[PDB]
Design an enzyme around this catalytic site. Structure first.
Site, mmCIF file in Angstrom:
data_model
loop_
_atom_site.group_PDB
_atom_site.id
_atom_site.type_symbol
_atom_site.label_atom_id
_atom_site.label_comp_id
_atom_site.label_asym_id
_atom_site.label_seq_id
_atom_site.Cartn_x
_atom_site.Cartn_y
_atom_site.Cartn_z
ATOM 1 N N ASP A 155 0.830 -1.206 0.000
ATOM 2 C CA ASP A 155 0.000 0.000 0.000
ATOM 3 C C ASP A 155 0.867 1.260 0.000
ATOM 4 O O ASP A 155 0.711 2.150 0.836
ATOM 5 C CB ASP A 155 -0.960 0.000 1.197
ATOM 6 C CG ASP A 155 -1.943 1.162 1.151
ATOM 7 O OD1 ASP A 155 -2.277 1.624 0.029
ATOM 8 O OD2 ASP A 155 -2.384 1.607 2.238
ATOM 9 N N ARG A 159 -0.118 8.876 1.705
ATOM 10 C CA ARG A 159 -0.631 8.794 3.073
ATOM 11 C C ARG A 159 0.212 7.864 3.960
ATOM 12 O O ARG A 159 0.050 7.852 5.178
ATOM 13 C CB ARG A 159 -2.096 8.330 3.064
ATOM 14 C CG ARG A 159 -2.288 6.970 2.427
ATOM 15 C CD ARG A 159 -3.744 6.673 2.132
ATOM 16 N NE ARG A 159 -3.841 5.871 0.916
ATOM 17 C CZ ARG A 159 -3.496 4.595 0.851
ATOM 18 N NH1 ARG A 159 -3.080 3.979 1.945
ATOM 19 N NH2 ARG A 159 -3.596 3.932 -0.294
ATOM 20 N N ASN A 160 1.111 7.089 3.351
ATOM 21 C CA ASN A 160 1.970 6.180 4.104
ATOM 22 C C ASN A 160 3.430 6.614 4.107
ATOM 23 O O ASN A 160 4.315 5.815 4.407
ATOM 24 C CB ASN A 160 1.869 4.751 3.564
ATOM 25 C CG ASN A 160 0.752 3.963 4.221
ATOM 26 O OD1 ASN A 160 0.500 4.110 5.420
ATOM 27 N ND2 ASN A 160 0.088 3.110 3.448
ATOM 28 N N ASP A 173 3.574 2.370 7.479
ATOM 29 C CA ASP A 173 2.382 1.632 7.077
ATOM 30 C C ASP A 173 1.358 1.642 8.206
ATOM 31 O O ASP A 173 1.451 0.842 9.134
ATOM 32 C CB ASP A 173 2.728 0.177 6.725
ATOM 33 C CG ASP A 173 1.516 -0.609 6.198
ATOM 34 O OD1 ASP A 173 1.672 -1.801 5.843
ATOM 35 O OD2 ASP A 173 0.407 -0.036 6.135
HETATM 36 C C1 LIG Z 1 6.616 -1.218 5.132
HETATM 37 C C2 LIG Z 1 7.055 -1.928 6.414
HETATM 38 C C3 LIG Z 1 8.571 -2.126 6.461
HETATM 39 C C4 LIG Z 1 6.328 -3.262 6.576
HETATM 40 N N1 LIG Z 1 5.279 -2.982 7.568
HETATM 41 C C5 LIG Z 1 5.463 -1.809 8.172
HETATM 42 C C6 LIG Z 1 4.811 -1.267 9.277
HETATM 43 C C7 LIG Z 1 5.266 -0.091 9.867
HETATM 44 N N2 LIG Z 1 4.721 0.336 11.004
HETATM 45 C C8 LIG Z 1 4.358 1.601 11.209
HETATM 46 O O1 LIG Z 1 4.464 2.498 10.374
HETATM 47 C C9 LIG Z 1 3.776 1.894 12.594
HETATM 48 C C10 LIG Z 1 3.947 0.990 13.637
HETATM 49 C C11 LIG Z 1 3.456 1.305 14.901
HETATM 50 C C12 LIG Z 1 2.805 2.520 15.088
HETATM 51 N N3 LIG Z 1 2.655 3.360 14.079
HETATM 52 C C13 LIG Z 1 3.112 3.092 12.845
HETATM 53 N N4 LIG Z 1 2.935 3.970 11.859
HETATM 54 C C14 LIG Z 1 2.090 5.160 12.038
HETATM 55 C C15 LIG Z 1 2.941 6.360 12.463
HETATM 56 C C16 LIG Z 1 4.329 6.260 12.524
HETATM 57 C C17 LIG Z 1 5.060 7.366 12.943
HETATM 58 N N5 LIG Z 1 4.444 8.490 13.274
HETATM 59 C C18 LIG Z 1 3.129 8.622 13.226
HETATM 60 C C19 LIG Z 1 2.329 7.559 12.818
HETATM 61 C C20 LIG Z 1 6.375 0.559 9.329
HETATM 62 C C21 LIG Z 1 7.028 0.029 8.220
HETATM 63 C C22 LIG Z 1 6.576 -1.155 7.644
#
Ligand SMILES: CC1(C)CNc2cc(NC(=O)c3cccnc3NCc3ccncc3)ccc21
Length: 286
Positions: A155, A159-160, A173
């Site tokens: 995705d 927004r990501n 994400d």
């Molecule tokens: C793309 C990948 C390497 C695979 N899955 C994933 C998930 C994340 N996780 C997050 O982005 C995340 C985890 C826990 C809490 N918030 C998250 N993201 C929202 C956020 C992050 C930083 N600042 C504000 C909101 C990051 C990177 C990846």
């Protein structure tokens, strides 16, 4: 990842050292929070499950994947986790106060010039082509890093993407047909090359300064058919001719014909160097 055990000695963080703040998203939920002694007091983003065995493995996988992937300047940085008994599973990462790139670019529409010349204070904090190309370059290095470790985002969109301190963006994400490649829609096939299609849509978002893709189009059966047939978005309002062609290269019908992220890193790096050279001259002449 899911095969590599979770090393608690390294990552485990105490639940009582966390002060939960307001929601950043709700879908499990992502909330802002204050962490004491995670790295004295620091701001972080936490992803936690609701007070489901399936949803549990999903968050635990995200955690294991993050440890495995490791660190990179253009990927949100994992700081810790609450996994031991006593409370909900929690995944903690650095907090990016500036939010997602789409909403940020959308707020700078009245603060843009293609480049600056003296006196530069007329454009204090304005966005320029340098910023836009730089955001694109950073995301590309970020995806190259992920692709090198066989990771597929699924995705990838504005927004990501999160804005950090000195114009540094990070891939995240929060966990959207408009960003999906044809083969993903019609075949449910996800690959590094379908992430390239998405990157292309992200480039459009960046050079339209946060606009929603496919403006004035109902995302129905026709939209999908045209996509399959070869219809593409027209160039956004702030793109250069090269950048629009790069978008088109990312939207190629055959996944194998699209450039790799390594090629985009190299290509964007050159468009950035050229832009910079052009800028030095503009600045030196005016
Ligand atoms: C793309 C990948 C390497 C695979 N899955 C994933 C998930 C994340 N996780 C997050 O982005 C995340 C985890 C826990 C809490 N918030 C998250 N993201 C929202 C956020 C992050 C930083 N600042 C504000 C909101 C990051 C990177 C990846």
């Amino acid at each position: 990842a899911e095969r590599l055990p979770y090393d608690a000695s390294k990552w485990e963080f105490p639940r009582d050292r966390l002060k939960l703040g307001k929601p950043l998203g709700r879908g499990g939920q992502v909330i802002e929070a204050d962490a004491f002694g995670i790295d004295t007091c620091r701001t972080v983003a936490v992803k936690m499950l609701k007070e489901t065995h399936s949803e549990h493995r999903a968050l635990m996988s995200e955690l294991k994947i993050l440890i495995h992937i490791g660190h990179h300047l253009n990927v949100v940085n994992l700081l810790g986790a609450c996994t031991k008994p006593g409370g909900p599973l929690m995944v903690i990462v650095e907090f990016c106060k500036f939010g997602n790139l789409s909403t940020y670019l959308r707020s700078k529409r009245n603060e843009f010039v293609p480049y600056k010349v003296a006196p530069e204070d007329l454009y204090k904090d304005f966005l320029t082509l340098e910023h836009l190309i730089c955001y694109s370059f950073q995301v590309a290095k970020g995806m190259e890093f992920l692709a090198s470790r066989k990771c597929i985002h699924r995705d990838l969109a504005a927004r990501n993407i999160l804005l950090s301190e000195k114009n540094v963006v990070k891939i995240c994400d929060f966990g959207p047909l408009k960003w999906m490649a044809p083969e993903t829609i019609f075949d449910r096939v996800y690959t590094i090359q379908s992430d390239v299609w998405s990157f292309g849509v992200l480039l459009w978002e960046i050079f339209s300064l946060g606009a929603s893709p496919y403006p004035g189009v109902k995302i129905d059966e026709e939209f999908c058919r045209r996509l399959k047939e070869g219809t593409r978005m027209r160039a956004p309002d702030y793109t250069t001719p090269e950048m629009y062609q790069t978008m088109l290269d990312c939207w190629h019908g055959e996944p194998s014909q699209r450039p790799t992220f390594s090629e985009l890193v190299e290509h964007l790096g050159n468009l950035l160097q050229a832009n910079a050279q052009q800028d030095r001259h503009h600045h030196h002449h005016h």
